[PDB]
């Protein structure tokens, strides 16, 4: 039939820049931390689904007043369109009506795609400033010295 997507917005999350992110062991662990645990304050829209597409960043929320809008940084949304769930920063908040407040999003690629050991699969790529494991660190110690 028609596909719907579910959102869950957060308050005053420490993540506000691309450079720093909270890496997790695996997607399940990250989801458990963001969804099941009570870390941060959050507005959950489990009951009310939304019609939204990742391609258009614009989003419109029903029951979030202007006062509640202030402080939102992170939004995690999962759509039936794509199995993979997504996370994004709420770059800009705008007021259009007493009943709706628009928010723009920017997909947080690092959290969405780089979880786990996926980056290790890259082949024949220039690397720089990588933290080293103990075996190679001891092996390479004179070079760093």
């Amino acid at each position: 039939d028609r596909k719907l997507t579910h959102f869950k917005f957060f308050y005053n999350t420490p993540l506000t820049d691309y450079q720093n992110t909270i890496h997790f062991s695996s997607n399940n662990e990250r989801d458990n931390y963001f969804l099941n645990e009570n870390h941060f304050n959050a507005i959950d829209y489990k009951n009310i689904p939304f019609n939204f597409i990742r391609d258009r960043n614009m989003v419109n929320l029903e029951q979030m007043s202007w006062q509640d809008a202030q402080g939102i940084n992170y939004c995690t949304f999962k759509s039936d369109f794509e199995n993979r769930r997504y996370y994004a920063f709420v770059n800009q908040i705008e007021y259009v009506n007493d009943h709706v407040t628009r928010m723009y999003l920017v997909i947080d690629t690092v959290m969405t795609y780089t979880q786990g050991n996926v980056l290790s699969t890259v082949q024949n790529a220039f690397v720089e400033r990588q933290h080293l494991p103990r075996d190679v660190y001891n092996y390479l110690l004179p070079s760093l010295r």
Partner: peptide
């Protein structure tokens, strides 16, 4: 509406369009 996926209100009888 802007994003109707499959529920297009072509028929004249229907007068309500959901999620739009």
């Amino acid at each position: 509406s802007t994003l109707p996926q499959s529920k297009v209100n072509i028929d004249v009888d229907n007068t309500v369009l959901d999620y739009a």
